[PDB]
Design a protein around this ligand. Sequence first.
Ligand code: CA
Ligand code: CA
Length: 134
Amino acid sequence: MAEALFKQLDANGDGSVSYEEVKAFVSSKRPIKNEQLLQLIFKAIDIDGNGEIDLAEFTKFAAAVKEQDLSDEKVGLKILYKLMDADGDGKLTKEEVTTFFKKFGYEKVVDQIMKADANGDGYITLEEFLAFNL
Ligand SMILES: [Ca+2]
Ligand SMILES: [Ca+2]
């Protein structure tokens, strides 16, 4: 008398879908509040050309982050992104990033960076950067 598999939840058997549905499905179990922040991050963590992810993508990603020889490498530039961020205070402004990312070795990114943001921030936060290379 128990269950734990998005399989049914989905049923569609399409494998992929809008985690949003899984975010709520789970949110109505152990958690309660987070489906938002998550769903959000996820939605952005996707943008692979739709917005519908697959339990696999999530799981794989988890097993991908689990590995102790990949993230760390980035963690470094990350910890630096947060530290170096003395003016940003959390978000790195074009100039900031451009210079930072460039000082780090992402001059060719400056292009995607400037073309990355353009909604209502004009800057790039830790995530953002990590988003470009997630
Ligand atoms: Ca996808
Ligand atoms: Ca932005």
